[PDB]
Symmetry: C6
Subunit: 84 residues, 6 copies
């Protein structure tokens, strides 16, 4: 997946998205994005938007957005027990 964060987005940036202190962006295959959306919905301080699905946008304060992005990335790696 691709991960990006936009700090202090302009109204124009929000308008492009929807046509927040921070915007976390995640792009991938739909199956990956639906999984990521679930982690983000369970994260405190964030609002989740499915950009139509092409992209996943996470809105909130920087700290909450960064924490939700870290959680999504950690769950994505999925290096569980018996992985070999």
């Amino acid at each position: 997946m691709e991960y990006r964060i936009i700090k202090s987005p302009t109204q124009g940036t929000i308008d492009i998205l929807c046509r927040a202190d921070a915007i976390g962006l995640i792009q991938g295959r739909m199956i990956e994005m639906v999984c990521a959306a679930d982690v983000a919905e369970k994260a405190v301080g964030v609002t989740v938007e499915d950009i139509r699905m092409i992209l996943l946008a996470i809105f909130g304060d920087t700290a909450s957005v960064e924490a939700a992005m870290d959680e999504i990335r950690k769950k994505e790696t999925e290096a569980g027990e018996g992985w070999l």
Copy 2:
């Protein structure tokens, strides 16, 4: 084919799609075949996420995991 499971999905997750959701992504031919195995599986509800993009399987964890296993087994089975 890609296989994923979401345990205890939120309403928001279900809203994006529409106690466990099994997700399967592949080529349409593969997904139509997988949908048939899932429809024949006990304890699961099947949803084609649409031009079909993804296959979603709803139910209790045990039933979802069992349906995913049968789909994967039927896909990977000759010289």
Copy 3:
């Protein structure tokens, strides 16, 4: 092309397709699928559906569906005289 057969399809499977004892499925490039559709239309015991074109679905009894699939595959290989 990709070839698959679904034996004793559920109503749900038919609903996914249309949104039969057997369903023969063929996926390929449109030119290949239009050619395949012609072989299937000339085959006894089968009904042909163009899934919109993404996929070609052949409906009927197993024997008729398998015979139509074999014919499509045989015509596709096209190892005619002077092929080199």
Copy 4:
């Protein structure tokens, strides 16, 4: 470009598209060029199968084969 011919097409085949049908698939630029050669060819009717996906050429076998040959010749013809 891909080239195929369907001899004695059924009505069902014609229905999917809309005594011989010549089919040509390629990039749009190539197909628009091919359509021009086919429109200038004797005994054939030209149909752009649509965002144009495929080019269909209808007529008697001899005319369809002759139009296909001219399209292929014009496409493959310098140092």
Copy 5:
């Protein structure tokens, strides 16, 4: 980019396009095509059509169409000073 010219197009060819002595055709990525469209709009003797954007069609007399195609191709190569 791909470049083609159709000399003495039939009405059917024009109908396929719009659904001229010559038709210049240019296919590429949108950014490349928008740049090409500008060169063509500044060229004498030609009319420019964006085929929807999939393709760029240039209409006019052969000489004007060929001159506009040459200009587009020359500007596309962009081997300017300090290129290394």
Copy 6:
């Protein structure tokens, strides 16, 4: 990402899109990030060319070139 600039665009060029137009093409995630840099840049107007395909930046040459430089710098910036 692809970057291009059109100096003194014609009305026809502007019509295809909708004294200098800066064009940036890339993946949506990259383009949304670039759009933010461009919206924060002096002397430029930002247009998302649409499902967003391309980013167009309008203004005087100096402002357009400065906004393009900042987009490119922010994109290319660790071990």
